[PDB]
Amino acid sequence: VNTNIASLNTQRNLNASSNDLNTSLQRLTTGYRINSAKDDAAGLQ
Amino acid sequence: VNTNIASLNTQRNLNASSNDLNTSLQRLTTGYRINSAKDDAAGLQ
Amino acid sequence: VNTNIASLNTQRNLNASSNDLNTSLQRLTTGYRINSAKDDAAGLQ
Amino acid sequence: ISNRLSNQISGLNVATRNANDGISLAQTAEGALQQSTNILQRIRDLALQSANGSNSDADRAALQKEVAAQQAELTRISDTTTFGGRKLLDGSFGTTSFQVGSNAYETIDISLQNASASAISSVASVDISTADGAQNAIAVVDNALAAIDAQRADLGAVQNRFKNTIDNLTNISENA
Amino acid sequence: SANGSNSDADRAALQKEVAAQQAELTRISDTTTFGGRKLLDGSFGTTSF
Amino acid sequence: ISTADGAQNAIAVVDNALAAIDAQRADLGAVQNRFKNTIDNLTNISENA
Amino acid sequence: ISNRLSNQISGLNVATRNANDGISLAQTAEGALQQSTNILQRIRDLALQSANGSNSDADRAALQKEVAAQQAELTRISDTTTFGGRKLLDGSFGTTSF
Amino acid sequence: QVGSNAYETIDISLQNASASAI
Amino acid sequence: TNVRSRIKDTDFAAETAALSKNQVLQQAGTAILAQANQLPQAVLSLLR
Amino acid sequence: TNVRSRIKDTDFAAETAALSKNQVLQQAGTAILAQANQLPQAVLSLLR
Amino acid sequence: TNVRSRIKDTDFAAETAALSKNQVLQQAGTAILAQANQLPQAVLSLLR
């Protein structure tokens, strides 16, 4: 049972949500959905 | 008596309940009943 | 519950009211109900 | 009866292993198709951005370039799913079988979609830049996207079939 | 499916799930080979114990 | 720029020219999306393995 | 009694889902008819602007053009409500059951 | 386009010309 | 979004009930096996 | 400026919803791992 | 406008009462479930 595959999944969804929050804060600081390339072509072009 | 068929059953229902908890946590992390295919067609389609 | 469908509605009615205020100010600056096309034919024609 | 019966029990254990490996495989297929799904949603969104008559044709070409990038990603998700080196769903997968009991030919056949990149006509065909292609595109990706999800439906059901199979399986094990 | 608001296309999708479940009924029907003379599918001959 | 005839033609230069920068920044932004989606599938293959 | 009863419970849950989807559907119908309502109020207002004998016939034609635009919008709200692709209220809806 | 389906659009009919044609 | 909410989301007041249940079932099953794996120790109290 | 506003800006009433969501997901996931990393401690309650 | 006011509007002094009520009912129900989901933990204090 060592692998404990409930934590592993939880770690994943946590880091995904945390990427979403890190970006969300990035969107709030400058107050722009667009701050870099990783959004989109519709973002900038 | 070696087989000890009370433990065996208990092991089964334990691993079934544990699958249910593993999924239950998966439903709580993202906060979605739906996180993959194994739920249903009514889940996604 | 993630969707939090009370905020969503509130966001809508907020942006609608805010469109109404943005226009209302537009009506007050020049002091005209009519400042562009989006009002009406009875506005201009 | 104990030799045959024990052999049956062992086969049942191996079947638990195989069915669970099948759940994990179909899980991999699910996730890859979540990403292709999100992409093809995105491609739909760009076709809708192009249908804006006010969106200039130059920027429509820019949208097309984004689309082409997303299409290359569809080719990549199509590839890269090498479970075992005989990967899931691109090109030609041969509709394998997963045994779930102890007897020969007591298997679950599974029917992964033969291809993803060029065959969801093609998603890669469309080249949005022209408005007349913007709307017809939406027809393409509309009849086309729901094939992805038709599969993800099927496989989700197959994962339920696995789980129920296992739930009976360990009972046959205990009774043996 | 009885939900009138559920579109006919998605009703077909439901049907596909159903068909999968039906194949599973055929499988549970099979696969119960206690001894090789399995329980309940097809023709079981009403044995005696 | 100093000459007027160069002032306007300049704008033609930097107009066809500036959009190559942004053509790249477009491409790379999409490539960053490709990365993110790749990773999202990637950690799934990890978990399933 | 537990098998039948459990099956009943499950049906009840699915019924919660279906009834709530019905609330949302009838909500969509409500909103679309709020917009058609606001329009047809507007069309009434223009008919009242035309009844002004002092309003010249040329500008009455202009009013008519606005009306025609609003009418095209009634055709659009009539369309565009494709819940599921079997849309609400234009043309022929077949009086479904929930 | 104002919905999600193809051909679910508002056509608009700007006047072809202004300078020589009023 | 209402429809997708009722499909795809979870109402956590249901989830936490499922959790409490499952946790009780695990802690139970563990503590049960503490006994099932000790019933065979009644053997060697008999004849050894 | 209207067009660039709808492209490049964020409506904060949407953002704050996304924040509240994400924060709940993090605090959740943390508190979940408080349990997932304690389910293996049910082991050594059994046979040790 | 008087009639339409009494039909279509809300007197907020009533609304805020309804809000205070509902908020209390939610915070209550949450805090209740904190106990209802812990009453089954009295089980494994018994025989485990």
Numbering used by the authors:
A (entry chain J), B (entry chain A), C (entry chain V): 5 to 49
D (entry chain W): 50 to 169, 385 to 440
E (entry chain g): 99 to 147
F (entry chain M): 392 to 440
G (entry chain K): 50 to 147
H (entry chain A): 148 to 169
I (entry chain A), J (entry chain J), K (entry chain L): 441 to 488
What did the published study say regarding this structure?
There are three parts to the flagellar structure: the trans-membrane basal body that functions as the motor, the connecting rod and hook, and the flagellar filament that acts like a helical propeller. Our current understanding of supercoiling in bacterial flagellar filaments, referred to as polymorphic switching, is based upon the notion that protofilaments within the flagellar filament can exist in two discrete states, that differ slightly in length. The “short” state results from a protofilament having a right-handed inclination (the R-state), while the “long” state results from a protofilament having a left-handed inclination (the L-state). To reconstruct filaments at high resolution, all protofilaments must be “locked” into the same state, either L- or R-type, producing straightened filaments that lead to non-motile bacteria.
Next, we analyzed flagellar filaments from the Gram-negative bacterium Pseudomonas aeruginosa to compare with a Gram-negative species. Since the D0 and D1 domains of P. aeruginosa and S. enterica share a high degree of sequence identity (55%), we tested the conserved L- and R-type mutations characterized in S. enterica (G426A and A449V, respectively), which correspond to G420A and A443V in P. aeruginosa, respectively. We found that these mutations also generate straightened filaments in this organism. Filaments from these two FliC mutants of P. aeruginosa were sheared off the bacteria, concentrated, plunge-frozen and cryo-EM imaged. Each mutation results in L- and R-type straight filaments as expected, which suggests that the D0/D1 architecture is indeed conserved between P. aeruginosa and S. enterica. For both the L- and R-type P. aeruginosa filaments, we identified three pseudo layer-lines in the power spectra from the filaments, besides the 1-, 5-, 6- and 11-start layer-lines that are similar to B. subtilis, which correspond to non-helical perturbations. We obtained near-atomic resolution reconstructions for the D0 and D1 domains for both mutants: at 4.2 Å resolution for L-type filament G420A and at 4.3 Å resolution for R-type filament A443V based on FSC of the cryo-EM density map with the resulting filament model. That we could reach such a resolution for D0 and D1 confirms that the perturbation is entirely limited to the outer D2/D3 domains, as previously suggested from lower resolution studies of other bacteria. In R-type subunits of B. subtilis, the side chain of E115 in S0 forms two conserved hydrogen bonds with the side chain of N240 in subunit S+5. These two sites (E115G and N240) are mostly conserved among different bacterial species, and we also detected the same interaction in the R-type A443V mutant in P. aeruginosa.
